[PDB]
Ligand binder design. Structure first.
Ligand SMILES: CC(C)(COP(=O)(O)OP(=O)(O)OC[C@H]1O[C@@H](n2cnc3c(N)ncnc32)[C@H](O)[C@@H]1OP(=O)(O)O)[C@@H](O)C(=O)NCCC(=O)NCCS
Ligand code: NA
Lengths: 277, 265
């Protein structure tokens, strides 16, 4: 719960003025997920309280410096009858490191359908990523050993230091380490953050290269997400990820996030650079 | 051919300044704006870098009677990647924003999923064929033809073969603008299929919110391409679709994603 509380406090941004916020970093380059979560927070502050995020698109232009604050500038694009759109610019040292555009909608009942949650083993029968990691050794990028803000339980373990040729699919159960506030928006920031884990490295699976192995350049180029339905992150959710394609030194992943009842919560898409040097 | 020739010209934009372009319209079709925006951005990019991705939002309906201005901001020029943001302007307002990324063609890891098992395009009737039982710039051979005024409960999947009605230039950039244009056809309406409602039914409000695409691989639009569309979701008066585009040999060439308004008045 301390890990979780630290993260939540980090995604609760400092207000500088209307649509100008300042966020601190985890410190331990900055994690894509932190920027995403903070960007969502920033944009949501500028939108009517009722209109909650339903989608965003982002490009990652530069690494963030984890030792320095990030400013989030929020541009008002349009407030229509239903939709409010915003562009978040994340700025450090006078340069943009990341842009997000996001769209918020007034709740309303409408047409309802969804695909099916893939058939996988429940989380009660799986080890956590931090338990499996102990065995491995390490670089000193050790977000694998400490207590984590989010518990990850993979259906199949993928050693970041040693790949094995595998199908380009990954399934991971996950959940906030602590009880969350009763406030959908905070669950949304956290989910955006969480959605950048166990994602892009899926594209390496057929090639049998672990994402931390020496000389492997892996970096996110873009990250987009769609919040289909409400959810809570203090109960188990499943991230189903496939990499439908790699080419041109790039790797492409799509994800779908389901609650334990099988409800389709969110969908994600990301392309990154995947280059063995 | 004729209709194809006028589309291609209408995607070759009038240059007003560096990063400012004017495009004629054919309300506007989403694909036109998309395809035009891609031209705009590509003009401001180093020669060798071709588009590998873009994201867009639709803010306002585009008036088809008037032209559209495409303003382009230069966002970054990196070691390999260049990024630009296009604003499409009409009546002094933004109707649409796209950010797009361009990269050098480079050799890397290769894999792809597998093209759906569908009837080949050679046996299939074109949509103009079906119409009797004017010329379109792109020939469409649907696996299953839908009636925009009559829906019936169908699975949230749709498969359409398509091709450029005419011989195209040996210029990947043009094939890309055109694929951009094409990607907005036989897409968002797939979301209505589980609901037995055609998109052109009375009281059906259907409008693109966002449209994003990834150009995984080179291709030609003057040979047959399959658009494989699913709607994995619909909720809160929106509908969500994902698309994948394969060439006739099963090569995955592009992916797409759009969310849209779908509301019954
Ligand atoms: C945007 C991105 C694709 C950069 O692309 P690029 O500058 O064209 O980089 P390339 O793919 O050619 O990178 C290769 C080189 O760039 C260098 N590089 C890294 N950051 C750089 C920067 N800001 N400017 C210039 N070069 C950079 C690397 O050291 C690497 O060395 P190499 O040429 O020997 O391989 C990507 O690498 C990136 O930086 N993404 C953002 C990072 C991120 O996730 N940030 C999270 C916080 S927002
Ligand atoms: Na602002």
């Amino acid at each position: 719960s301390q890990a979780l509380e630290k993260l939540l406090d980090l995604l609760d941004l400092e207000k500088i003025e209307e649509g100008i916020f300042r966020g601190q970093s985890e410190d331990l380059q900055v994690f894509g997920g932190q920027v995403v979560g903070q960007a969502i927070y920033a944009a949501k502050q500028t939108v009517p309280a009722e209109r909650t995020v339903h989608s965003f698109h982002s490009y990652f232009l530069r690494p963030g410096d984890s030792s320095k604050p990030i400013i989030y500038d929020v541009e008002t694009l349009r407030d229509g009858n239903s939709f409010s759109a915003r562009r978040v610019s994340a700025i450090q040292n006078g340069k943009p490191i990341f842009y997000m555009t996001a769209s918020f909608q007034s709740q309303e009942e409408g047409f309802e359908h969804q695909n099916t949650m893939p058939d996988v083993p429940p989380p009660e029968g799986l080890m956590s990523e931090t338990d499996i990691a102990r065995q491995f050794p390490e670089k000193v990028r050790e977000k694998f050993i400490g207590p984590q803000p989010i518990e990850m339980r993979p259906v199949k373990f993928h050693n970041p230091l040693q790949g094995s040729v595998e199908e380009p699919n990954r399934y991971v159960w996950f959940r906030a380490n602590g009880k969350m506030p009763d406030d959908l928006r905070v669950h949304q920031y956290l989910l955006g953050y969480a959605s950048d884990f166990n994602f892009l490295p899926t594209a390496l699976q057929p090639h049998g290269i672990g994402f931390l192995e020496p000389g492997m350049q892996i970096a996110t180029i873009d990250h987009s997400m769609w919040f289909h339905r409400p959810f809570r992150l203090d109960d188990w959710l499943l991230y189903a990820v496939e990499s439908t394609s790699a080419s041109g030194a790039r790797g492409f992943v799509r994800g779908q996030i389901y609650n334990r009842e099988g409800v389709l919560v969110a969908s994600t898409v990301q392309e990154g650079v995947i280059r063995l040097h």
